[PDB]
Amino acid sequence: AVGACVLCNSQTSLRCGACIRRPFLCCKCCYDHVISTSHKLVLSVNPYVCNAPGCDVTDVTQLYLGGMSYYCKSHKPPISFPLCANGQVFGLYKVTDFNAIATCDWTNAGDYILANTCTERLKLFAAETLKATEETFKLSYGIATVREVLSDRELHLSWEVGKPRPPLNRNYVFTGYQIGEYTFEKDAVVYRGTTTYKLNVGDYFVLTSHTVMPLSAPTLVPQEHYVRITGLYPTLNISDEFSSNVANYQKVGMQKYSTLQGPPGTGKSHFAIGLALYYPSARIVYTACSHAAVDALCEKALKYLPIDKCSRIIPARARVECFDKFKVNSTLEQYVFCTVNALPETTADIVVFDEISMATNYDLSVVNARLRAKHYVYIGDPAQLPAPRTLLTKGTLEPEYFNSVCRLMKTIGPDMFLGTCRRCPAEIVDTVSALVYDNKLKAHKDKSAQCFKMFYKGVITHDVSSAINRPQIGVVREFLTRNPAWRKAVFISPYNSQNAVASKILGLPTQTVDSSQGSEYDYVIFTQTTETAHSCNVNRFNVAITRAKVGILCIMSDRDLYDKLQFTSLEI
């Protein structure tokens, strides 16, 4: 009840009772909140409510102090002070942006913009509020009761009447009933249990409403520059394989935190694992939001770092299969590979946070909370995909608003930029270089002459809101008969539903752009499916075409993105 004011840190007894997080507001700040917003309930030891029996006045602007108690205009004694006067609310020890964050429903881009252009304590307030709102929204959706079981991977579902049904994809994970987490894909529908269970009829699934803990740590610890490499000890015998990165590795040592922008295939993993070889005694925690991102860092580490000094941290509430070739849950190994949400309370010489475009400010805060470290390294690419904002339906969230790291990378630039793509045929490198990297990304590879574009709008059907384009798949089927080398190709599209149909008709393995991120494949077939802001997003497009090492076929719906592809055009 006695805390610090989220805006100016001043001590007070005043929390807003109208904010979902109930932040401590100082007398001067609590005023400027309650006089500008629909937020009128002020809490303390005891609520600012009229003490008169049966009186329902809770609005602080309609309330007065009479003795050591509070009353409305109808009930106050002759000698009474209005609680709200002289730009203050009476409390012990006696902001536009705070107001917009406190009251917004988080459905507008402008909400996320302000949650990332504000002060550092407001970014945390913003982040808890957003996450709180995100969780209280999961309650809104309807329960999914099993009507009948078909096979070991398919069933039919009965939904709760009166409550909406949540988008059916791999994004939305339910907890079954505690028979383990589950996912669903398209009256036949496909069931995928984290725990293999003989699906029982009647049993129900509900969305995993996890409790939003308060944040304490900043998103970014304040920046420190050093004259000399602080708290780390470099090698002189540094493998030629990592010689390119020595000056960057010395930058990491001469700052508290550092930002690395590495476009696809430019050596992010190589740089991350290369940091351990350059500072060989240093204890490094390797963290990212997703199991895949951490598992990619584990695969790199397996190749170059001693396996006896590596641990993959796994939460006992195990969700997906992940990396098995380390000692599991040894927190005290020199090398710890762990998802943000599972991080132990520990210390480190270096923390490497990877896939930073996918991090929220909640995630950035948590990492600073659990890991006290000499150096924080932030790796990823603001031209790649952000974390889905499940509440955001209006406006598009630009890369400079993804999180504080991306904001820095897009405003003052990254500390370090990996400038040469070694994965992709030049046709792909030249396209994305112009599109999102201001022509600063260079091709190592030659043009493959295996990169093709076809402008084919086809016909757009919808599985609810998820888009399908059968004719675009028809064009792919036709291409495959004439191009048998592409038989091995991964099929990629911005929509699960399109992927479901392409799986059945083509037999290619299938991936959404968003799930493709971090992976690479010899051949990619991309069907844009629709012309929407989702399918035309330049970051998503960037990720889609940079998955390929040898060949790509893009069936396009959008003239702009089609024309920009520096590919050989096909006919039909």
- The least distance separating Zn ion from the CB of residue 81, rounded to whole angstroms, comes to 15
Contact predicate 556/456, CB 8 Å: yes
Is 267 labeled as ligand-binding?
yes
Cα four-point dihedral sign 296, 299, 300, 302: positive
* 149 counts as binding Zn ion under rule CB under 5 A: no
Task: Determine which residue in the list 57, 313, 351, 489 makes contact with Zn ion, applying CB under 5 A.
Answer: 57
Structure tokens at 535: 């399918």
* 123 counts as binding Zn ion under rule CB under 5 A: no
What is d(CA 70, CA 75) in angstroms, rounded to the nearest whole number? Answer: 9
Q: Which is nearer to Zn ion, 26 or 252 (CB)?
A: 26
Q: Which stretch binds Zn ion (CB under 5 A): 13-21, 161-169, 176-184, 315-323?
A: 13-21
Q: Which stretch binds Zn ion (CB under 5 A): 3-11, 128-136, 206-214, 478-486?
A: 3-11
What is d(CA 561, CA 434) in angstroms, rounded to the nearest whole number? Answer: 12
Q: Which stretch binds Zn ion (CB under 5 A): 38-46, 305-313, 430-438, 558-566?
A: 38-46
Is 527 labeled as ligand-binding?
no
Tell me how many residues contact Zn ion (CB under 5 A). Answer: 18
Q: Which is nearer to Zn ion, 7 or 314 (CB)?
A: 7
Is 433 labeled as ligand-binding?
no
Half-sphere exposure of 555 (CA within 13 A, CB side): 27
* 273 counts as binding Zn ion under rule CB under 5 A: no
Is 176 labeled as ligand-binding?
no
Give the relative orientation of helices 27-34 and 96-103 as an angle to the nearest 10 degrees.
60
Q: Which is nearer to Zn ion, 57 or 336 (CB)?
A: 57
What is d(CA 265, CA 137) in angstroms, rounded to the nearest whole number? Answer: 38
* 146 counts as binding Zn ion under rule CB under 5 A: no
Query: Interface residues for Zn ion in 182-201 (CB under 5 A)?
Result: none
**Residue 503 burial by CB count (10 A; 0-12/13-18/19+): exposed, middle or buried?**
middle
Angle at CA of residue 243, ends 238 and 245, nearest 5°: 115
Q: Which is nearer to Zn ion, 92 or 328 (CB)?
A: 92
* 26 counts as binding Zn ion under rule CB under 5 A: yes
* 50 counts as binding Zn ion under rule CB under 5 A: yes
Structure tokens at 493: 């599209």
Helix (H) or strand (E) run with residue 105 in it: none
Q: Which is nearer to Zn ion, 12 or 334 (CB)?
A: 12
* 126 counts as binding Zn ion under rule CB under 5 A: no
Q: Which is nearer to Zn ion, 83 or 408 (CB)?
A: 83
Question: Gaps (C–N > 2.5 Å) in the chain: which residues precede them?
Answer: 94, 177, 186
- The least distance separating Zn ion from the CB of residue 128, rounded to whole angstroms, comes to 13
Q: Which residues contact 385 (CB under 8 A, 6 or more apart)?
A: 357, 358, 513, 514, 517, 539, 540, 543
* 272 counts as binding Zn ion under rule CB under 5 A: no
Helix (H) or strand (E) run with residue 130 in it: helix 120-138
* 229 counts as binding Zn ion under rule CB under 5 A: no
- The least distance separating Zn ion from the CB of residue 12, rounded to whole angstroms, comes to 7
Structure tokens at 371: 């890991």
Residue 334 DSSP symbol: S
Task: Determine which residue in the list 21, 24, 31, 39 makes contact with Zn ion, applying CB under 5 A.
Answer: 39
Q: Which stretch binds Zn ion (CB under 5 A): 21-29, 167-175, 384-392, 413-421?
A: 21-29
Q: Which is nearer to Zn ion, 26 or 275 (CB)?
A: 26
* 101 counts as binding Zn ion under rule CB under 5 A: no
* 10 counts as binding Zn ion under rule CB under 5 A: yes
Specify which residues 569 forms β-bridges with.
Answer: 453
* 122 counts as binding Zn ion under rule CB under 5 A: no
- The least distance separating Zn ion from the CB of residue 56, rounded to whole angstroms, comes to 8
Is 91 labeled as ligand-binding?
no
Q: Which stretch binds Zn ion (CB under 5 A): 32-40, 288-296, 469-477, 502-510?
A: 32-40
* 8 counts as binding Zn ion under rule CB under 5 A: yes
What is the Cα Rg of the chain in Å? 27
Contact predicate 101/115, CB 8 Å: yes
DSSP string, 339-401: EGGG--SEEEEEEEE-SGGG--HHHHHHHHHHEEEEEEEEEE-TTSPPPP-TT--BS---GGG
* 7 counts as binding Zn ion under rule CB under 5 A: yes
Give the relative orientation of helices 268-278 and 291-304 as an angle to the nearest 10 degrees.
50
What is d(CA 230, CA 186) in angstroms, rounded to the nearest whole number? Answer: 54
What is d(CA 127, CA 101) in angstroms, rounded to the nearest whole number? Answer: 10
Q: Which stretch binds Zn ion (CB under 5 A): 99-107, 172-180, 409-417, 441-449?
A: 99-107
* 95 counts as binding Zn ion under rule CB under 5 A: no
- The least distance separating Zn ion from the CB of residue 15, rounded to whole angstroms, comes to 9
* Annotation: binding site for Zn(2+): 5, 8, 16, 19, 26, 29, 33, 39, 50, 55, 72, 75
Summarize the annotated binding site for a ribonucleoside 5'-triphosphate as residue ranges. Answer: 262-269
Q: Which residues bind Zn ion (CB under 5 A)?
A: 5, 7-8, 10, 16, 18-19, 26, 29, 39, 50, 52, 55, 57, 72, 74-75, 102
